[PDB]
Amino acid sequence: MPEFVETPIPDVNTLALEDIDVSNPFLYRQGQWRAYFKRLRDEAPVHYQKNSPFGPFWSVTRFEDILFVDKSHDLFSAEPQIILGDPPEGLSVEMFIAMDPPKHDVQRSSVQGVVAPKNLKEMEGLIRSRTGDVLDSLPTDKPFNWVPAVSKELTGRMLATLLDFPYEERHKLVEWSDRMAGAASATGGEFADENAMFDDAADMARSFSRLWRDKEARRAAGEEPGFDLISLLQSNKETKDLINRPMEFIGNLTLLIVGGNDTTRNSMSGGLVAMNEFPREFEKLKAKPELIPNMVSEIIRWQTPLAYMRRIAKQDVELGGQTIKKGDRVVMWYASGNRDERKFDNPDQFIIDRKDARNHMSFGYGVHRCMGNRLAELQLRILWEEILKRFDNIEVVEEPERVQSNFVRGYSRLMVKLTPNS
């Protein structure tokens, strides 16, 4: 697993169509991703790259084509993986995000109760109060890094709540999730030490087993089950014994924590970046706070926290005037589709009252459409409500540092200065 070392990305018009390689995990940081995807959308909407560090792959970059691919599980498989590359040999974990129907459906239906409306309504007060306390704690006298202070802080707490994982150890959930989703061989991310991946897998399984048993014993001793996933699984006849199917046990708990880890964090960081590029939108918001839910959809579209999901063609498929061969990897570039002017007028503008913001494809479409979508939107809505209660302005004071990945579109440093109300 070689490290990816940053080099300057040239202008896309310097290249031949055939040599456009969008697997490069520095395209987002260097701010080249937009022009690169624009050339793909306009000149090669269904595009084969025969030569990449991850092997050959197709890129699908227009909004309508991505819908078709994502919705067509009869034609494209999500197995065995949904990142572009491969996980390191021997620590593939099976997750339903990378499974086809019918097995996908059974696994998803066994956990979906944790984000049912009535269950999210139970989490709401705790989300609000944490959000409030975090924001109350922030300094207003000087800049600070919003990423660890707010985005990661609130996210780590949410992950712990989802499993009733011991609160004081929540950092481990985030760490385990980062290392899994950031493997160099998978996404071109910064994690290239396979030993730490094996260590984490071992520790996770020890820690999740211990928790499962602890929660069984607590329930038997008469603690009321909570709104978490483990309580939910222990309530249903079908999942009461999930610990004895180790692959589904680890897979489902892992998927749930990875699912809302960097996505929600980067949505939280992202809206401040968008507000800084389009500061009028923040005045519009203060004047019409009822826009928050639509703004949340706009933040998610604009940021597009996951750039893609990957599929394999189950058979030959004609698309965009090209022939995708059975067995070929195909990458649905949501980051491109959400900036497709054929769908969205003024795609690169952040417009918090954009009429069709809700139609973004940041959550995908079809049978793998993000199961946590309402939980993400809930958290974002609450963040901005609580921001509006406290702050007349939120200024980004330094160019953000962006994460190295072809999959995560994220921020590691976001220096912010707050100005309180009165």
Ligand code: HEM
């Ligand atoms: C803004 C935040 C988020 C974004 C952008 C996001 C994005 C996605 C995407 C793109 C998919 C796959 C779509 C496809 O293949 O068609 C997905 C699946 C999933 N997400 Fe999220 N997600 C977010 C938040 C969350 C949260 C908070 C959770 C859980 C607590 C979560 C849990 C899941 C799960 C379980 C799946 C698997 C769905 C399936 O395979 O049926 N996500 N998410």
Ligand SMILES: O=C(O)CCCCCCCCCCCO
């Ligand atoms: O080793 C493996 O199988 C795991 C490597 C792939 C990591 C997949 C990350 C899943 C992202 C889920 C985001 C859903 O909101």
